[PDB]
Amino acid sequence: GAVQLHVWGPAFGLPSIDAECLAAIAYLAQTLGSADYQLIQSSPSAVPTQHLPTLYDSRTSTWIGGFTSITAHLHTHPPPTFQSTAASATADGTAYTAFLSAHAAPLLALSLYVSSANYGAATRPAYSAVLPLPLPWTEPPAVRAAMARRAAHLGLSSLDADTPEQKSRIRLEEAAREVLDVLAEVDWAAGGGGRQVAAEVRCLAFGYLALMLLPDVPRPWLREIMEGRYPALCTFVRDFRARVFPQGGKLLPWADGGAQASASASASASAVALRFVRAVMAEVPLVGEWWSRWWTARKKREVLASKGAKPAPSNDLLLLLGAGLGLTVVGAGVFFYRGLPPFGEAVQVWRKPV
Amino acid sequence: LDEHILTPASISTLEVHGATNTRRSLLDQIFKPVLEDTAAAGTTLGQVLDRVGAATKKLARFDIFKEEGFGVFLSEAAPPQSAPPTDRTDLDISIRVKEKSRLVFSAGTDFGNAEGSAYTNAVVRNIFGGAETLTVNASTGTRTRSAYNATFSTPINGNPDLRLSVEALRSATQKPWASHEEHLTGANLRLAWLTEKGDTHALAYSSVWRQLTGLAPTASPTVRADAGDSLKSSLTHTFTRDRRDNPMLPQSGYLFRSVSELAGWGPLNGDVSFAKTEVEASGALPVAIPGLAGKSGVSVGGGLRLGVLYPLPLGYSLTGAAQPSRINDRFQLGGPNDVRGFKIGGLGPHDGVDAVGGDVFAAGSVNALLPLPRTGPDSPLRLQLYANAGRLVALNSKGTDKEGKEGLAMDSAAVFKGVKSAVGKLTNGIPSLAAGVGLVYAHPVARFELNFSLPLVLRRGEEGRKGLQVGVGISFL
Amino acid sequence: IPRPLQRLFDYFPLRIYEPNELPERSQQLTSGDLPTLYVFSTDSDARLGLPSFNPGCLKWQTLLRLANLDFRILPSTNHSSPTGSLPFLLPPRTSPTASPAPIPASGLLSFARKNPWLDLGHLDADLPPRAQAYLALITHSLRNAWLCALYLDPTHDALLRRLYVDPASSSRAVRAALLHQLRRAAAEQVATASSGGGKIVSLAPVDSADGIDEEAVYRSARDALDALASLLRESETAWFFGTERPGSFDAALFSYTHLMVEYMSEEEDTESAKGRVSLGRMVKEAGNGELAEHRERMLGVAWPEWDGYRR
Ligand SMILES: CC(C)[C@@H](C)/C=C/[C@@H](C)[C@H]1CC[C@H]2C3=CC=C4C[C@@H](O)CC[C@]4(C)[C@H]3CC[C@]12C
Ligand SMILES: CC(C)[C@@H](C)/C=C/[C@@H](C)[C@H]1CC[C@H]2C3=CC=C4C[C@@H](O)CC[C@]4(C)[C@H]3CC[C@]12C
Ligand SMILES: CC(C)[C@@H](C)/C=C/[C@@H](C)[C@H]1CC[C@H]2C3=CC=C4C[C@@H](O)CC[C@]4(C)[C@H]3CC[C@]12C
Ligand SMILES: CC(C)[C@@H](C)/C=C/[C@@H](C)[C@H]1CC[C@H]2C3=CC=C4C[C@@H](O)CC[C@]4(C)[C@H]3CC[C@]12C
Ligand SMILES: CC(C)[C@@H](C)/C=C/[C@@H](C)[C@H]1CC[C@H]2C3=CC=C4C[C@@H](O)CC[C@]4(C)[C@H]3CC[C@]12C
Ligand SMILES: CC(C)[C@@H](C)/C=C/[C@@H](C)[C@H]1CC[C@H]2C3=CC=C4C[C@@H](O)CC[C@]4(C)[C@H]3CC[C@]12C
Ligand SMILES: CC(C)[C@@H](C)/C=C/[C@@H](C)[C@H]1CC[C@H]2C3=CC=C4C[C@@H](O)CC[C@]4(C)[C@H]3CC[C@]12C
Ligand SMILES: CC(C)[C@@H](C)/C=C/[C@@H](C)[C@H]1CC[C@H]2C3=CC=C4C[C@@H](O)CC[C@]4(C)[C@H]3CC[C@]12C
Ligand SMILES: CC(C)[C@@H](C)/C=C\[C@@H](C)[C@H]1CC[C@H]2C3=CC=C4C[C@@H](O)CC[C@]4(C)[C@H]3CC[C@]12C
Ligand SMILES: CC(C)[C@@H](C)/C=C\[C@@H](C)[C@H]1CC[C@H]2C3=CC=C4C[C@@H](O)CC[C@]4(C)[C@H]3CC[C@]12C
Ligand SMILES: CC(C)[C@@H](C)/C=C\[C@@H](C)[C@H]1CC[C@H]2C3=CC=C4C[C@@H](O)CC[C@]4(C)[C@H]3CC[C@]12C
Known part of the structure; x- marks a missing residue:
């Protein structure tokens, strides 16, 4: 286990529920050996990068977050068991990676998270089934809010995701087509003809299309559109799944011999309590945003130090002593005020002048 | 005895x-x-x-x-x-x-509801036992721009007449007439003082940050050009001599009010520099019919308001280039509390539908309260006939020649000539005039008034109301 | 009931005068014989119609200049836009107190077609799907890199202040507040990106430079620049997709490359200290100078009179 990949738990008969995490899992399975990496089910609060998927290079103890960063790092520092118009192919791969991460993610967010019916039936149970007990009340809400913000530019809402209803279906179909037509020009099957893209691009495309197609939802507008209109993409997704993750991807080297047991290392009682507490203080109406900013800065400094940079020393001691001084001043003032004898008397009398 | x-x-x-x-x-x-x-x-x-x-x-x-x-x-x-x-x-x-109670705290909270509407009203009073009063009026909307108010008042050397106040505010005024909203954020420092004769001086220093945002789709090019950020650090003096028997229903006496403000010039620093002064003079003369005895209730009132907005350079020199005024500072005329018979901001320059302001104005009023039949003179009800008139013109540099490639900068002579021309424009032509009848309610907290108006003379592009118009408040022309 | 009294309400008013003249500021700013495009620029630059320093305004200004529309530009702010964001166009006043409705960025090209100072299909033609995939690079990777380097980078603090907060107000407190909100907004946009972002910290979006991967954003920008250079190299002509005249794709790329070369192309001493190549240097070195020569050609086509465009 030279490198450890921290990803979400399995869902919808797939190794992971997140598109980027599934893409990273597929890339690792296709390139690295079975015993050269470990998969760890986790949540963003469990990793200092605060973002999944996250790779921890145990050879150097480096925290790398993001699918693109993980793929770039593994090319520069490959593990021992690594086996990955050339310029035009690289340019096409970069362009399609950017297009996927920029436009296919809002579509998946609209299908799974923005849609209230779909989120309340499959997505929320799937997220709650891969987290310890008190977490599903803090992390899935943040994930859903982030995905809704991602898909906000699409201009569609939960009501649209299903007579005005038939007008919304046209908008959904147009939004799906605007992405699927672009994605359909590439020969993701790596067969004869069509465009050619890198293995990383193919893995990312599968990661997005798998969550856009396979999950069974009460309102499968996206799955119906895909099956009806893009049989090539449906066949690519099915073949890639059946080739890379057979029997639901249970043969992957999950930590401690299982997906559920993998999370147990970082899901101790104290760790889960601390994560839940931090999530709670992050929502305080007054100091929540300041606490979140301080924690984010601390974790960013930790990640940079792990990478090898030399961040400026933190000024936490100065802030702590200033806050303590202010608290002591406030306490002294309130103690002076409390117990002060009344400023006047009940009766007040003035004698005649002398 | x-x-x-x-x-x-x-x-x-x-x-x-x-x-x-x-x-x-x-x-x-x-x-x-x-x-x-x-x-x-x-x-x-x-x-x-x-x-x-x-x-x-x-x-x-x-x-x-x-x-x-x-x-x-x-x-x-x-x-x-x-x-x-x-x-x-x-x-x-x-x-x-x-x-009184030493702490009033009207925390009307709807935290469960999305619209919080938490109008906190901390009115902590008599701190230190010297009539010091701290008032907090924080409030929130439907997750919109939250309001904020905090005033601390204290008499000077235990003198109830001389009172010093410090205020910090954050509000959002809506201006439907000009198709925008103003976001105010700043602090004030007032020194009120009541003279033994009854006059009320008030010296205030204000440093607020104005923000024109939320333009309506019908916003005029003038409103669009004036939108942005501005800071106004001004020193203003307010003088009031209210000799009226009843401020809500003035039947006798007179009122003289002067609001003089200096912004941006000299030690003050800001994005706007001007010298604004407004003068208001009112009065009322009872008319007793000799046939009837006691207080007849018939009075013939009047009023007159004037205002000049003089652009000034930024610095310690009285002779220098001065920028033209902005829609934030220009005067507004028209409405029930203003010249009646016109829409709120119905007088002055109008860019399309937006009611942009003016630099000088001159309003007037001639009313006559009349008592209702089978009703005592002491009753707050009264019948009113008014003849409101007003003018509102804006400064421009038409007379001055050779403005130069660099614009929006008028020299002292140009500003003086523009002010003279603007003041002269008030004298020529009949002012925007409206007349009508209505009933006025003299409720002690605030005056209520509903009248049937009928505009007579107005400039093109001005808005007047020909039907029933209601008016509430404490200041009326 | 409406019929009888209407003969009385219509008689009044008795006398109507000519409308009051507009204020001096309104007469100086809103009066013009040409349509005015309101962009992020300076007073000196707007007099000569030089390119704006905001890429969003610059793209539309370049498209309008390629559309042959005779127009002028004036500095403005986001608060004055009908859609809450620059740029927008105000057609000339028909009357001294009446003006037509503002034209948003979406309707800019449609407006430019009705006033041919023609066949403007190339400026708004639908792109092929591969062209859309490549446009994703410009609209996400380059935009995120520009936003990060301009706002969240302390190196460009003086440039950001001079471009955005100094002309807004002369008050130090107001300038600081505006800078704080600008940085918050820019961090919020940058964080909504799979590369260099995507951190889950709370139910609120990330609004700080510490929730953003600057290295990932920079790497994505470099990859995007190389890919765009290769795509330009594919075309046989001097423009993208082998077109005879520049189009929407060329304008979109130019609106970022020109600004990067103009402002971010600083000295190598700063680059050597941190090992980070500046955005302008990356633009110049992408491919074999294809992006730099494309920017020069776009400048020679849309601003043929200008000559101080080097940096
Ligand atoms: C309301 C919030 C703010 C906080 C203070 C409340 C926390 C309590 C009510 C929650 C937090 C974690 C919860 C918790 C964690 C784990 C388990 C194990 C399970 O087998 C039985 C229930 C049990 C023991 C529950 C009970 C309820 C707890 C203790
Ligand atoms: C006993 C176990 C098995 C389960 C069924 C019980 C759950 C209830 C009693 C408890 C456990 C965790 C609690 C819980 C977790 C987290 C939060 C977030 C906080 O901002 C609001 C309250 C809220 C939503 C509370 C509400 C009460 C919950 C949901
Ligand atoms: C597998 C099991 C053994 C793991 C999950 C244990 C969970 C329990 C012991 C943890 C999970 C969440 C924790 C928890 C959540 C929130 C709070 C609120 C805080 O103000 C007091 C402690 C309290 C109440 C702690 C107590 C310990 C809890 C309930
Ligand atoms: C030690 C401190 C941190 C303890 C005593 C404070 C707890 C309070 C301030 C916390 C505990 C539970 C929190 C809480 C629970 C649930 C929600 C719903 C959410 O939609 C808005 C915030 C809100 C309403 C937050 C606000 C802050 C609360 C009320
Ligand atoms: C208090 C002392 C000084 C005595 C003299 C009071 C004088 C005031 C109240 C009197 C003196 C002259 C009066 C006066 C003069 C002329 C007019 C014009 C008329 O169309 C409206 C009433 C009005 C405006 C009245 C109002 C009341 C005034 C101003
Ligand atoms: C910006 C300007 C408009 C501000 C500073 C105006 C200041 C002047 C006009 C104010 C400030 C203090 C005022 C003042 C102080 C005290 C008194 C004593 C009183 O028995 C007569 C009036 C008199 C003399 C008034 C007159 C008006 C004064 C002199
Ligand atoms: C400002 C307030 C007090 C209102 C009541 C104004 C009143 C006066 C000044 C107004 C009301 C009626 C006006 C008036 C009526 C008719 C004419 C005939 C015209 O050929 C010359 C102007 C002239 C003579 C104007 C001058 C201004 C007058 C006299
Ligand atoms: C009640 C008295 C004191 C005064 C104030 C009232 C004046 C109003 C009611 C009347 C008196 C004289 C009238 C008057 C005189 C002459 C003209 C010229 C005409 O071409 C337009 C109407 C106009 C301008 C009218 C408008 C209405 C006026 C101004
Ligand atoms: C329509 C207006 C122009 C008519 C009514 C005329 C005057 C009005 C404005 C009234 C309002 C206040 C009055 C006023 C206030 C106080 C005094 C002091 C007194 O010793 C002389 C008269 C004098 C100066 C009067 C004159 C008339 C005034 C100035
Ligand atoms: C020959 C040129 C240089 C002359 C006429 C120009 C300007 C100077 C000297 C004078 C002329 C008019 C003066 C002027 C007119 C009116 C007012 C309003 C008053 O509330 C504040 C002072 C103020 C603003 C002064 C300031 C000084 C000014 C502007
Ligand atoms: C050539 C003449 C017939 C034209 C200019 C009309 C009117 C003349 C008589 C002028 C002379 C004085 C002017 C006059 C004096 C005072 C005021 C008070 C102000 O509150 C409104 C304007 C008003 C009422 C104007 C209106 C126009 C008047 C009455």
Whole structure:
């Protein structure tokens, strides 16, 4: 286990529920050996990068977050068991990676998270089934809010995701087509003809299309559109799944011999309590945003130090002593005020002048 | 009694009850002058009683005591002083007063509902036992721009007349007439002062950050050009002489109000530099029909308001290039509390539908309150006929030639010529005039008025209302 | 009931005068004989119609200049836009107190077609799907890199202040507040990106430079620049997709490359200290200078009179 990949738990008969995490899992399975990496089910609060998927290079103890960063790092520092118009192919791969991460993610967010019916039936149970007990009340809400913000530019809402209803279906179909037509020009099957893209691009495309197609939802507008209109993409997704993750991807080297047991290392009682507490203080109406900013800065400094940079020393001691001084001043003032004898008397009398 | 006021008396002891949370120095500087006022020692029961009444009226000014709890007990002084110079010369009075609640906190909260509407009203009062008052008026909307207000008031050297206030505010004013909204964020420093004659001076320093945002889709190019960020650090002086018998229903007397403001010039620093002054003069003359007796209720009132906005350079020099005024500072005319018969901001320059302001204005009014039949003159109801008129013009540099490639900068001569032309434009032509009848309600908290208007003369692009128009508030033309 | 009294309300008013003249500021700013495009620029630059320093305004200004529309530009702010964001166009006043409705960025090209100072299909033609995939690079990777380097980078603090907060107000407190909100907004946009972002910290979006991967954003920008250079190299002509005249794709790329070369192309001493190549240097070195020569050609086509465009 030279490198450890921290990803979400399995869902919808797939190794992971997140598109980027599934893409990273597929890339690792296709390139690295079975015993050269470990998969760890986790949540963003469990990793200092605060973002999944996250790779921890145990050879150097480096925290790398993001699918693109993980793929770039593994090319520069490959593990021992690594086996990955050339310029035009690289340019096409970069362009399609950017297009996927920029436009296919809002579509998946609209299908799974923005849609209230779909989120309340499959997505929320799937997220709650891969987290310890008190977490599903803090992390899935943040994930859903982030995905809704991602898909906000699409201009569609939960009501649209299903007579005005038939007008919304046209908008959904147009939004799906605007992405699927672009994605359909590439020969993701790596067969004869069509465009050619890198293995990383193919893995990312599968990661997005798998969550856009396979999950069974009460309102499968996206799955119906895909099956009806893009049989090539449906066949690519099915073949890639059946080739890379057979029997639901249970043969992957999950930590401690299982997906559920993998999370147990970082899901101790104290760790889960601390994560839940931090999530709670992050929502305080007054100091929540300041606490979140301080924690984010601390974790960013930790990640940079792990990478090898030399961040400026933190000024936490100065802030702590200033806050303590202010608290002591406030306490002294309130103690002076409390117990002060009344400023006047009940009766007040003035004698005649002398 | 009628004959009791002849006997001279002297105030021996002054006792005050129910002031357990008030500093001695507060009552010290007000009650000794009452105490030693018996120097005359002649028919004092006809003068010291009113003196004590004035003293308790001054006591009411502190706001820290309950009005319904003002008590004054009087009793002849039992000690038989040797050789009394006059009858019952020894006299003591007793004053009993109950303080208001020391902390009022009207936390109307709807935290469960999305629209919080948490109008916190911390009115912490009488801190340090010297009539210091701290007021917090924080509020929130439907997760929109939250309001914020915090005022701290304190009398100076325990003088209820001279009062110093510090305020920090954050509001969002809506301006439907000009198709935008103003976001205000700044602090003030006022020094109010009540003269013994009854006048009210008020010197205030304000440094607010204005923001024009939320433009309506029908916003005019002028409003679009004036949108952005601005800071106004100004020093303003307000003087009021209200001799009217009833401010809500002025039947006799007069009112003179002057609001002079200097912004940006000299030590003050900001994005706008001007000298704005407004003068308001009002009056009312009762008309008693000789046939009827007592207060007839018929009066012939009037009014007159003037205002000049003079652009000034930024710096310590009176001779320099000055920027033209912005829509934030320009005057607005028209409405029920203004020249009647016109829409709110219905007078002055109009860019399309937006009511942009002007630099000088001159409003006037001639009303005549009339009592309703089968109704006493003391009744707040009254019938009114008005003849409101007004003008509102904007400054421009048409007369000045050779503006230059660099614009929006007028020299002293250009600004003076523009001001002269703007003032001259008031004299030529009939002012925007409207007349109508209506009923006025003299509710003590605020005046209510509903009238049937009919515009007569107005400039093109101005808005007038020909139907029933209602008006509430305390300031009317 | 409406019929009888209407003969009385219509008689009034009795006298109507000519409308009051607009204020001096309104007469100086809103009066013009040409349509005015309101962009993020300076007073000196707007007089000569030089390119704006905001890429969003610069793209539309370049498209309008390629559309032959005779127009002028004036500095403005986001608060004055009908859609809450620059740029927008105000057609000339028909009357001294009346003006037509503002034209948003979406309707800019449609407006430019009705006033041919023609066949403007190339400026708004639908792109092929591969062209859309490549446009994703410009609209996400380059935009995120520009936003990060301009706002969240302390190196460009003086440039950001001079470009955005100094002309807004002369008050130090107001300038600081505006800078704080600008940085918050820019961090919020940058964080909504799979590369260099995507951190889950709370139910609120990330609004700080510490929740953003600057290295990932920079790497994505470099990859995007190389890919765009290769795509330009594919075309046989001097423009993208082998077109005879520049189009929407060329304008979109130019609106970022020109600004990067103009402002971010600083000295190599700063680059050597941190090992980070500046955005302008990356643009110049992408491919074999294809992006730099494309920017020069776009400048020679849309601003042929300008000559101080080097940096
Ligand atoms: C309301 C919030 C703010 C916080 C203070 C409340 C926390 C309590 C109510 C929650 C937090 C974690 C919860 C918790 C964690 C784990 C388990 C194990 C399970 O087998 C039985 C229930 C149990 C023991 C539950 C009970 C309820 C707890 C203790
Ligand atoms: C006993 C176990 C098995 C389960 C069924 C019980 C759950 C209830 C009793 C408890 C456990 C965790 C609690 C819980 C977790 C987290 C939060 C977030 C906080 O901002 C609001 C309250 C809220 C939503 C509370 C509500 C009460 C919950 C949901
Ligand atoms: C597998 C099991 C053994 C793991 C999950 C244990 C969970 C329990 C012991 C943890 C999970 C969440 C924790 C928890 C959540 C929130 C709070 C609120 C805080 O103000 C007091 C502690 C309290 C109440 C702690 C107590 C310990 C809890 C309940
Ligand atoms: C030690 C401190 C941190 C303890 C005593 C404070 C707890 C309070 C301030 C916390 C505990 C639970 C929190 C809480 C629970 C649930 C929600 C719902 C969410 O939609 C808005 C915030 C809100 C309403 C937050 C606000 C802050 C609360 C009320
Ligand atoms: C208080 C002392 C000084 C005495 C003299 C009071 C004088 C005031 C109240 C009187 C004196 C002259 C009066 C006066 C003069 C002329 C007019 C014009 C008329 O169309 C409206 C009433 C009005 C405006 C009245 C109002 C009341 C005034 C101003
Ligand atoms: C920006 C300008 C408009 C501000 C600073 C105006 C200041 C002047 C006009 C104010 C400031 C203090 C005022 C002042 C102080 C005290 C008194 C004593 C009183 O018995 C007569 C009036 C008089 C003399 C007034 C007149 C008006 C003054 C002199
Ligand atoms: C400003 C307030 C007080 C209102 C009531 C104005 C009143 C006066 C000044 C107004 C009302 C009626 C106006 C008036 C009526 C008719 C004419 C005939 C015209 O050929 C010359 C101007 C002239 C003579 C104007 C001058 C201004 C007058 C006299
Ligand atoms: C009640 C008195 C005191 C005064 C104020 C009232 C004046 C109003 C009601 C009347 C008096 C004279 C009238 C008047 C005179 C002459 C003209 C010229 C005409 O071409 C337009 C209407 C106009 C301008 C009218 C408008 C209405 C006026 C101004
Ligand atoms: C329509 C207007 C122009 C008519 C009614 C005329 C005057 C109005 C404005 C009234 C309002 C206040 C009045 C006013 C206030 C106080 C005094 C002091 C007194 O010793 C002389 C008269 C004088 C100066 C009067 C004159 C008339 C005034 C100025
Ligand atoms: C020959 C040129 C240089 C002259 C006429 C120009 C300007 C100077 C000297 C004078 C002329 C008019 C003056 C002027 C007119 C009116 C007012 C309004 C008053 O509330 C503040 C002072 C102020 C603003 C002064 C300031 C000084 C000015 C502007
Ligand atoms: C050539 C003449 C017939 C034209 C200019 C019309 C009117 C003349 C008589 C002028 C002379 C004085 C002017 C006049 C004096 C005072 C004011 C008070 C102000 O609140 C409104 C304007 C108003 C009422 C104007 C209106 C126009 C008047 C009455």
